[PDB]
Design a protein around this ligand. Structure first.
Ligand code: JPP
Length: 517
């Protein structure tokens, strides 16, 4: 009986779609590779050739011979996947019976580590594994073809009957990222990390008018063309997967809820003396404690938890929760890519006072840097939230009004004072422009469950520019800076300054800090 003939179907591998940046710079490029395979049934008739084949493949003579012997009844085995066509030619040139070529594709990432977390990469089979490669795998992958062949009793092809399905290439995908801004960001987050002996960080740049991610970089990073060094940590797209308590960076949202309540205007006053406020067993504390009356701007400039807490008791936590939720903090109303974390916004039917105050000044919730950037974009875009995109946006979808335009404009001008006023975050100033934002510094949650660590910090700055016609929102998050000065305004705000400056200049944004004309 046995088998004199077989009909089988072998794949025609398809060309995966080019990934570019928003200007057509290649970021992921399908590269011709040569996969060597062999038919053991045919190899078995030419043993005298095996040693020169094993040497060609960098394999021990005996272990190779053992492998072939052990698979003598099979018709297919991989020798090696993914060598260059030049190297596959070197093995093919030996003319060993039963050794064959498949012309395949494998990815190359020309920007390497610079954009590795955003682009992601493919597995051994050329299917998306992380990032864009995975999120847009159906678009990029295309469909492999199918060829019907006739085969004899030892797996040798007698004839190509027909192509049953044509291979169709995957489609080109242009990201929203500008590789020039991405590089700038990369380099400046890298430098600040090193300068501060920090463990990790992220930076996200968004177009506030289009919802586009113009840049997304994290440290540590890795070279996606050589993933031998293997370290899982370095592969984390922290901007999208690592949640943190945003601390004082959410105070502009609490303030938007105050302004919207009917009960507060910027020039109203809060008594924050003596810099602490007891709430049953918990004490709210400010870092600087030489204040009494502060106006609402001043509460943001000095970053008083007490002042923001007293506002929150007056307007109620529900209003603050609603703002945070509407801007996307702890919500799944972002990109929603595979692997992305949502974080968490605590909810209560009856908010106790401690939870009300902590929410208002940014603890008891957890958000990602992308969320925080998107929230800042909505504030900067006169309270309108344009849907997030990682792909180039030619037709901008409709924004949703999440904060009233007047409230958003009032809070903008407060955040510009936070940067520009005496006692403010002067290091966030952007030469040429008016900039606006908010610093944050949060003690990290103690690892073995519990509470907080007195040694370890997350250093934040979030903002936008130009303050008077906003274009760009940006978040800089630096995890465990290790020097004397660890405050957001020392650590993160200068990175904001430099990367915002570069980005506005790259985008030809006209200066708006000009003598009053
Ligand atoms: C729920 C308990 N629990 C947990 C953590 N915790 C907390 O981490 N506190 C930080 C804080 O108060 N940060 C504020 C907003 O981030 C202010 N803004 C900073 C900035 O602008 O850089 C600042 C000027 C350094 S103070 C803090 C305290 C001390 C030093 C640096 C930062 C609390 O307070 C708090 O109650």
């Amino acid at each position: 009986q046995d088998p004199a003939r077989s009909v089988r179907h072998i794949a025609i591998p398809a060309h995966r779609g080019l990934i570019t940046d928003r200007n057509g710079e290649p970021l992921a490029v399908s590269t011709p590779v040569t996969t060597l395979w062999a038919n053991p049934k045919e190899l078995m008739t030419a043993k005298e050739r095996w040693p020169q084949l094993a040497a060609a493949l960098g394999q021990d003579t005996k272990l190779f011979a053992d492998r072939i012997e052990q698979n003598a009844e099979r018709e297919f085995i991989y020798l090696v996947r993914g060598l260059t066509p030049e190297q596959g030619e070197g093995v093919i040139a030996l003319k060993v019976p039963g050794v064959y070529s498949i012309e395949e594709f494998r990815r190359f990432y020309p920007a390497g580590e610079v954009v590795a977390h955003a682009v992601g990469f493919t597995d051994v089979d050329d299917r998306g594994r992380e990032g864009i490669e995975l999120a847009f795998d159906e678009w990029l992958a295309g469909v492999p073809g199918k060829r019907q062949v006739l085969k004899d009793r030892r797996g040798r092809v007698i004839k190509d009957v027909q192509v049953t399905k044509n291979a169709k290439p995957g489609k080109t995908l242009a990201l929203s990222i500008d590789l020039r801004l991405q590089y700038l960001a990369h380099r400046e987050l890298r430098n600040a990390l090193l300068e501060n002996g920090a463990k990790a960080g992220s930076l996200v740049i968004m177009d506030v008018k289009t919802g586009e991610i113009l840049a997304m970089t994290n440290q540590p990073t890795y070279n996606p063309n050589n993933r031998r060094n293997l370290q899982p940590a370095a592969m984390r797209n922290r901007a999208m997967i690592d949640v943190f308590e945003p601390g004082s960076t959410v105070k502009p949202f609490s303030m938007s809820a105050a302004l919207a309540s009917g009960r507060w205007k910027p020039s109203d006053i809060v008594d924050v003396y003596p810099g602490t406020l007891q709430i049953g067993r918990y004490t709210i504390r400010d870092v600087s404690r030489n204040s009494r009356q502060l106006d609402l701007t001043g509460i943001l400039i000095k970053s008083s938890n007490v002042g923001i807490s007293k506002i929150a008791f007056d307007i109620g936590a529900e209003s603050i929760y609603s703002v945070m939720q509407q801007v996307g903090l702890g919500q799944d109303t972002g990109l929603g890519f595979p692997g992305e974390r949502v974080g968490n916004l605590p909810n209560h039917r009856k908010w106790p006072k401690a939870e009300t105050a902590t929410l208002a000044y940014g603890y008891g919730l957890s958000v990602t840097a992308i969320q925080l950037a998107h929230a800042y974009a909505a504030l900067a875009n006169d309270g309108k939230s344009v849907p997030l995109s990682m792909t180039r946006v030619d037709r901008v979808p409709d924004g949703v009004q999440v904060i009233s335009p007047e409230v958003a404009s009032t809070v903008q001008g407060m955040l510009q004072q936070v940067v520009e006023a005496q006692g403010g975050v002067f290091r966030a100033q952007v030469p040429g422009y008016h900039a606006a934002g908010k610093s944050g510094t949060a003690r990290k949650v103690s690892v073995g469950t519990k509470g907080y660590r007195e040694n370890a910090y997350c250093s934040l700055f979030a903002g936008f520019a130009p303050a008077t016609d906003p274009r760009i929102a940006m978040v800089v998050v630096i995890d465990e800076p290790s020097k004397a000065g660890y405050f957001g305004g020392l650590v993160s705000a200068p990175v904001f300054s430099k990367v915002m400056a570069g980005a506005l200049r790259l985008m030809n944004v006209p200066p708006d800090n000009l003598p009053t004309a």
